[PDB]
Design an enzyme around this catalytic site. Structure first.
Site, PDB file in Angstrom:
ATOM      1  N   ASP A  40       0.673  -1.294   0.229  1.00  0.00           N
ATOM      2  CA  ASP A  40      -0.101   0.157   0.008  1.00  0.00           C
ATOM      3  C   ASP A  40       0.878   1.210   0.112  1.00  0.00           C
ATOM      4  O   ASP A  40       1.083   1.791  -1.161  1.00  0.00           O
ATOM      5  CB  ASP A  40      -0.940  -0.009   1.096  1.00  0.00           C
ATOM      6  CG  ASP A  40      -0.391  -0.587   2.439  1.00  0.00           C
ATOM      7  OD1 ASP A  40       0.630  -0.185   3.083  1.00  0.00           O
ATOM      8  OD2 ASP A  40      -1.268  -1.475   3.091  1.00  0.00           O
ATOM      9  N   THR A  41       1.500   1.464   1.050  1.00  0.00           N
ATOM     10  CA  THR A  41       2.289   2.890   1.335  1.00  0.00           C
ATOM     11  C   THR A  41       3.884   2.448   0.750  1.00  0.00           C
ATOM     12  O   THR A  41       4.282   3.521   0.139  1.00  0.00           O
ATOM     13  CB  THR A  41       2.436   3.021   2.841  1.00  0.00           C
ATOM     14  OG1 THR A  41       3.126   1.965   3.539  1.00  0.00           O
ATOM     15  CG2 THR A  41       1.028   3.283   3.479  1.00  0.00           C
TER      16      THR A  41
END
Lengths: 195, 189, 197, 193
Positions: B112-113
């Protein structure tokens, strides 16, 4: 019609191995139906010993899920004090469990037990942590090779003494990725020891 | 069928279909590179816990394509910050062999990040592999806080409580054969 | 005075070493008086590399306390991949720090830097964790032996190339407990290399 | 002199005097045992963090008495309880060499409940050392929840916030040369934060 130049013969196909895993998981589900396992609060904890067991475990826990046995996965990893000596069966801890096992039902998961020196060592270690219960399940059992009496609670298959490779098992960290369990050709073993 | 699950994103079968495609794609990318067992395997650095199941299926699919691999497992944990901008994590378990001069494929469960993945990538890079790529089970590109493109992606997803096939909520449901969406109710409880 | 059959000569007595440790510590105090160090919230973090640095570290941090430099101790441990030696300088992490170093003033503490391959590897690793500052202090500097350029910020003493032992430093995990840093006799080295055969 | 401290329990010098005494006692106990460097050292398994400073001084004092040693360090952490009855802990770092057949001395900073120490002892025992003892810096015997006698003790204490000489409060004050009692006020203020 999966074939391997480096192997004398195949011992267990992927499918044979999956069938037995299903049988072992059924039995487990049965032995623990009484114990009121529940997700979050009271799962069966699988202490999977790396590297060898990584594949067995991935297949085993899905088979367990099929029988509605809820599970917590832990991974440990240990390394040999490269002696040859050791009757204590002692190994070096490199990765211990993320959560407390105390009061939980634990199943130690291992790829091969021969001497059981190391499995016995790890059984004792985790037993003194007071889990609600503690049992062992093994991919392969080579009972011929015991140097300490030890019976695994669950056994996918028995084997004789040979260079067993595949399905997570290795020779020199090679061949873990095979779908089958196979017998390494002694010539290949000898050729690699020269190098 | 699963009571705790809004829906099924991917069935086991869909997943194995994608993994076979990713696997073929890898086999094609490394054919020029002279991989050989013992001496020059593709090293998979599988990040625990969430990638364990993916890795088991992926390395078998790679074996179908005669891609010789070496399996390494590493384990990191979060420092108790709300959220960190270096993407640093604590090293609990590191590779057994040196990766210097080998072809390395990092295997992750969810990106995700990408902060953590970027930190690991960079760490592994300074170790001087011949080459470095990453393969991820699920890509949530919506989420990035650092620029990072996975080389191989099993499937893209939106933002959601994603569980199953190794992935957890509170170390639960990793054992499921399918990737599925958690009920927010079950989450709240 | 202390004496040792296994040593060609003494290089640094305990007291010589303690004096230089005090001088280094004073310097560190002086370099960080501006940075507003405070216990709990903003200490100077000592990343001490085991096993070799353990004794150095134990003495150095008391000396730092003498100059009112508040410190947080971390201990890391790493092991050689059995490549003769490698150009990345890479090592295996066995124990990493307990707390985040992000935003903190960090001092990596090492016993010996020769190649600096491993210290450079560890400097870079912790640097990308974004501490407020990151410096190194070394017990012994063998500048002759560099295979990557690297300057320690603080150096207790320079040495030439010899089997250096004592004060935390080992040969085959022996002689770490000596109070002094001494030079191991080549005969004793040879007797021991033959012996594990 | 220290603002955060009610009083000084032991000065650096007192501490070194006791450590020298304990070291002599050890050198005497193991003289019959044929310790030799490389092949048969007394192995000190020093438990991180709090024992680091004690260990540094203790092995030097042991060297004064010609006791050959091998230094190992281990590091364990707490599982998220208030506490636990098995005294189990999580292994983060383990010994580099096998302890099988060697004389082993486990070095700890403080023993209160002894649950943790009892678990480490037992684990190390199953490793079949030739012999196993423990030496501790501070013994708080008042606190035992399992029966355990340290073989070597540097000093006994009452119940108190004890800091310095490697012992911490919230990973602070390990660097002090003396062992000192924390002011409860300083304790309360930091708990707030």
């Amino acid at each position: 019609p999966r074939e391997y130049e480096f192997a004398e013969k195949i011992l267990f196909t992927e499918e044979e191995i999956r069938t037995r895993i299903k049988e072992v998981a059924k039995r487990i589900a049965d032995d623990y139906k009484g114990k009121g396992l529940r997700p979050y609060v009271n799962p069966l904890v699988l202490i999977s010993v790396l590297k060898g067991s990584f594949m067995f475990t991935a297949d085993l826990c899905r088979a367990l899920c099929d029988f509605n046995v809820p599970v917590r996965m832990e991974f440990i990893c240990v390394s040999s004090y490269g002696e040859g000596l050791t009757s204590s069966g002692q190994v070096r801890m490199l990765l211990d469990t993320r959560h407390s096992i105390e009061g939980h039902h634990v199943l130690i998961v291992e790829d091969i037990v021969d001497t059981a020196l190391t499995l016995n060592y790890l059984y004792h270690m985790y037993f003194t942590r007071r889990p609600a219960s503690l049992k062992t399940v093994v991919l392969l059992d080579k009972r011929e090779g015991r140097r300490v009496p030890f019976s695994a609670d669950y056994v996918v298959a028995n084997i004789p003494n040979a260079f067993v490779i595949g399905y997570g098992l290795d020779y020199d960290d090679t061949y873990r990725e095979l779908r089958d369990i196979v017998v390494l050709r002694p010539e290949v073993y000898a050729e690699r020891e020269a190098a």
